Amino acid sequence: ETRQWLPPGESPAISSVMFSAGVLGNLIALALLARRWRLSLFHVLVTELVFTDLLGTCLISPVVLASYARNQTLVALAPESRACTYFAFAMTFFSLATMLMLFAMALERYLSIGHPYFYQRRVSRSGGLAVLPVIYAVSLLFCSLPLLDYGQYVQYCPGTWCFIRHGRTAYLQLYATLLLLLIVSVLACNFSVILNLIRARRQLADLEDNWETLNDNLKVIEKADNAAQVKDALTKMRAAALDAQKSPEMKDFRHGFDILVGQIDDALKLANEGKVKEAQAAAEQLKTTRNAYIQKYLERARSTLAEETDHLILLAIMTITFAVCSLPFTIFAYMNETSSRKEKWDLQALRFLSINSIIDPWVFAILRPPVLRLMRS
């Protein structure tokens, strides 16, 4: 299928603005990520995601840009159909490898948030840099198959696309199978992290509620003259301490309440004997011990939960804008070409497949680190 004919009134309006927006978003994303480089395991993966979009844009886009001079965009620019052989291989490579890069981002949050053991397990930050050659290596092996004899490339109707053609050869079905499985895999990791984050919010809420129970009842002991009110306030504090207590920080958190409950038992011991003033004296020492160990864990809990949920928002917007664009290609590949006499889903799948790589760097440009409004809305 070689569609040489093209209306003379073709203007390079859509191509130029798309290439400009893509390169500008990639450069802005690289410049803003370089500010952190002087940076986390999740951020270093975003650097390779915009780098893959920038590397692909510099190879895929300029091919159709220079060929806009003639009426026929690109029939055969170089012998042996080298023009499409370079265009089709580039779009096929930078589409599966880019989706594999999203899987590495989703798998990172899945291992870190989902499994506490994998977080304690050392994952070298420099190892994240080695992911990019591995992702390109796996994608290169799968994308090398259509380069053989059974692989076929035909020119689409606009004359600038020559992506994989549906035929008797079973490769377009396998290529969409990997993309479909990756979408489900990335969504499965996101759904797991969301469930883990929601469970993390309830644990922090219960921990904060027990923290308020300790502080509120502590003020009652200071103004409680009768020993009955002192024993009643210490009773709710002791139960709240056992509920809050339920890695180096984990061992210190348990030991923090183990000595804290003992101070409550000592204050309850003086309250039973009738020493109200001595019981209030132990209550003052209880505040110093609690702020030394327990308060430090609460501050880290609020900071860690806030930082990880921001990375999830960055991951959630990107996978949504990969899913809406990759679904037309999934339906197009699975459906037979002979089923539709005048196939129109093919051209639509080509558009979204290129748009998603352009939107991804702009997503990070809109979602700045001040996402506190999006975190709690």
């Epitope: 301490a241 509920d243 038992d265």
Partner: antibody
């Protein structure tokens, strides 16, 4: 193994005094607090006394304050409870138990071993 | 002065049936709720401690669960050796120990 034997129960006239003894075997009383629970015939359980031989603190039920006196002897490794000015409602069964100190695993295992208990009947 | 209230007071079932007992605490207690089994003419025995773990020696048929301030004792399959009175106890403090009202399972016919 860990065993707790109670003794000293029986018939007591109202307004008198009785000395109950709880002997432990298999462990030391200085590492576990000793509790005395009472159960009335045709009713449930009711904690009536507690002592901690590690520090010497004692506690009783609000209904029995001022009439019971609990003590522990580490030389003999046992507990003695003296009951003065008994009433008609004291006809019950007394059980002896141990409770570990906080923190640790035996602390959450409250009353892991229960004694045989002895019967007390206060009737004139 | 927490007053433990046990709603199940009399339940009749046979072997193989599931039994559910509920214990209610007047005040919030984190995990200081234990279940004890007392046979007629015998000393009680601890079944479930901390409402999560199982005692070393008791059969695995008994299980414990927590929901808010309500504790649940679940027996999957009854046996002729499990027909005894059940008691709920709180052990939040050494001086704060209050038992429930009791629950004795019966054989239905």
């Amino acid at each position: 193994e860990v065993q707790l034997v109670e003794s000293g129960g029986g018939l007591v006239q109202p307004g008198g005094s009785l000395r109950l003894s709880c002997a432990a075997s298999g462990f030391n009383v200085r590492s576990f607090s000793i509790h005395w629970v009472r159960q009335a015939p045709g009713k449930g359980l009711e904690w009536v006394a507690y002592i901690s031989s590690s520090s010497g603190s004692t506690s009783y039920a609000d209904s029995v304050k001022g009439r019971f006196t609990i003590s522990a002897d580490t030389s003999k490794n046992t507990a003695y409870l003296q009951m003065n000015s008994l009433r008609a409602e004291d006809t019950a069964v007394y059980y002896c138990a141990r409770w570990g100190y906080w923190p640790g695993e035996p602390w959450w295992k409250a009353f892991d071993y229960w004694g045989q208990g002895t019967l007390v009947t206060v009737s004139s | 002065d927490i007053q433990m209230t046990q709603s199940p007071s009399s339940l009749s079932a046979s072997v193989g049936d599931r039994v559910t007992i509920t214990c209610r605490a007047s005040q919030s207690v984190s995990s200081a709720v234990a279940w004890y089994q007392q046979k007629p003419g015998k000393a009680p025995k601890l079944l479930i401690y901390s409402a999560s773990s199982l005692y070393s020696g008791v059969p695995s048929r008994f299980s414990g669960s927590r929901s808010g301030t309500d504790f649940t004792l679940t027996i999957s399959s009854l046996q002729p050796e499990d027909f005894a009175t059940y008691y709920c106890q709180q052990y939040l403090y050494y001086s704060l120990v209050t038992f429930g009202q009791g629950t004795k399972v019966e054989i239905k016919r």
